């Protein structure tokens, strides 16, 4: 599996638009929000919420959770071929779905909330979760093989009041599924040392800021800590979910995260939703005591607002940013790939980027510099020995004043010229 290891102004990445595969009807005129794209083996899970009207508050038309195969579409280009689609009854109660694939089934764990987004109405949230299993290769049946919902006998959340899936994709190890998650911890019970917060090189930074921005506001009742939710299929007739907190090395507010096998090992990515705006991801050293050997990356960051803009590294009170994940594609050189919004303070201009810790190797702009965009989900795999990445990129449609997900399949280039 050989790819260019040299920085090169050449336009050697040539992405293909394969969004036609997904269930997006542009002609409907609808906003498509809350996307999820998970790929493992030859299979993928996909989800979105389709709205008539504004993306924030237009009326929900449908929530889709679908699974299928990633196949060579006929010309050595991968496409998504959806085979099994479930529309949740009561679309408005389903939030924060996360997907892990094991043994011919994709399992999606979703928060259920009749009080709104659990992150925003967190003290009133029931805490209840739903686990849905979808066959990737369905079969003619009279019951639930193709789709059924499971019983979570218990939820072991430890000292947290509430735990929740929080991010698109997880991993399997044996029969144990690990979803990216977040724990809600009462702020008064959050033990932290202000001296630890890194204000040494920052003149306007204050010691309180790191603790204060572990919540969505300085006076939030809860703080959010990222982690994993563990589901051992080979454990009782109805298994329990067990929350597993992330280590406190390079701690940031709990945010949409992702854990993925790449080249034989799990990698963890955490979105930077506050002041540590440099990309947070790296090899998982241990899963159950979750500790991530974070990359010390000096080139990739995300756009923010005025308080925590791109390239900010000084502690600050802020809850802003965008989920732009990255996929390791060569562990010998630690080269990774992702789509990043190449702007300091506005959510615009998606650029597909192949990069090292201290160097962007090569890039393709997928749209114009003025083109508004948001969430980005990248997944890479082999197709007949070719490293391919499929990136979902939320892009703004100025004609309908809405946002819609576009899919790019991008072959990583073997040769720099």
């Amino acid at each position: 599996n050989n790819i260019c290891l040299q920085k090169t102004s050449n336009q050697i990445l040539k992405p293909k638009l394969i969004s036609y595969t997904l269930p997006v009807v542009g002609q409907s005129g609808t906003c498509i929000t809350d996307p999820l794209l998970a790929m493992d083996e030859g299979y993928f899970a996909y989800s979105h919420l389709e709205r008539i009207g504004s993306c924030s508050r237009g009326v929900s038309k449908q929530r889709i959770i679908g699974v299928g195969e990633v196949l060579d579409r006929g010309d050595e280009v991968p496409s998504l071929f959806m085979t099994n689609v479930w529309t949740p009854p009561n679309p408005n109660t389903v939030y924060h779905c996360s997907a892990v694939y094991n043994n011919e089934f994709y399992y999606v764990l979703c928060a259920v909330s009749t009080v709104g987004d659990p992150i925003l109405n967190s003290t009133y949230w029931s805490g209840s979760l739903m686990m849905t299993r979808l066959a990737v290769k369905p079969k003619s049946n009279g019951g639930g093989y193709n789709q059924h919902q499971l019983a979570l006998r218990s939820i072991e959340k430890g000292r947290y009041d509430k735990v929740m899936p929080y991010g698109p994709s997880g991993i399997k190890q044996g029969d144990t599924l690990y979803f990216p998650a977040v724990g809600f911890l009462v702020r008064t019970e959050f033990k932290y040392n202000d001296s630890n917060c890194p204000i040494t090189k920052c003149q306007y930074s204050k010691p309180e800021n790191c603790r204060l921005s572990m919540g969505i506001r300085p006076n939030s009742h809860y703080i959010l800590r990222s982690g994993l939710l563990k589901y051992n299929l080979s454990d009782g007739e109805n298994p329990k979910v067990v929350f597993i907190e992330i280590s406190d090395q390079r701690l940031s507010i709990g945010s949409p995260s992702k854990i993925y096998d790449s080249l034989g090992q799990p990698v963890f990515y955490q979105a930077s939703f506050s002041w540590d705006t440099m990309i947070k991801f790296g090899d998982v050293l241990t899963v159950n005591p979750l500790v991530v050997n974070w990359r010390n990356n000096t080139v990739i960051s995300r756009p923010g607002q005025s308080q925590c803009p791109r390239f900010n590294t000084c502690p600050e009170i802020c809850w802003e940013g965008v989920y732009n994940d990255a996929f390791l594609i060569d562990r010998i050189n630690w080269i990774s790939a992702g789509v990043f919004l190449d702007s300091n303070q506005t959510a615009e201009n998606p650029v597909f980027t192949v990069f090292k810790d201290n160097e962007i190797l090569y890039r393709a702009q997928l749209a114009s510099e003025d083109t508004n965009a948001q969430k980005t989900i990248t997944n890479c795999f082999l197709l007949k020995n070719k490293i391919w990445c499929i990136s979902l990129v939320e892009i703004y449609d100025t004609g309908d004043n809405v946002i819609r997900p576009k899919l790019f399949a991008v072959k990583i280039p073997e040769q720099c010229t």
Partner: antibody
Amino acid sequence: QVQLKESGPGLVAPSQSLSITCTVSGFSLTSYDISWIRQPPGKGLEWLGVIWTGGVTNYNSAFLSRLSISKDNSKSQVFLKMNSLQTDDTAIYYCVREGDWFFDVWGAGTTVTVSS
Amino acid sequence: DVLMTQTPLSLPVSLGDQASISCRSSQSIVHSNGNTYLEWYLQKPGQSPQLLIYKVSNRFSGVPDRFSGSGSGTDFTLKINRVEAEDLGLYYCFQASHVPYTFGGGTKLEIKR
């Protein structure tokens, strides 16, 4: 108690820049999109820009060179910045809350006068 | 870039009579979603504008039933039957089917007494 409150400078010299801070109460900036509207004195209402819950920003084409909209989710503050201000710019400036492409709630407005 | 024209700059009306304001859009205002986002707002003296009608004929929460929006294509009218004194002010139509959103020039309702 859902309210939008606008703090502005009152007076702005020609060619210098206008900065307004809107503090929002009873709602989450992540929950609702926020838009900026201005009334020129005597003259009718005009729409300048919107900041989405995600942070996507959409602006009137006319003010795109001179207008920036930003938000702090943690401090519940939305910020409007404008540049190269002129007498035509003098107006009451409104921070508005949007539901389904309609303005449900409106700030009281801040009066901005361009003058030396 | 989509222009909204309000036909009566000034409307004088007696109490209990019916006031009728017109709004023309320079283009079709139907969205791909198939909803026409035409809204009517009132500004009473001394106050910020407030929403009356959205999606052509829907009364915003709290608006009395004597306020009424109709329209088709590019012609919209708001009717206030049994006009009450507290109705006096400035009425604006507004479209959010196209960015940039645009307002009409306004209509001042005056009460004949």
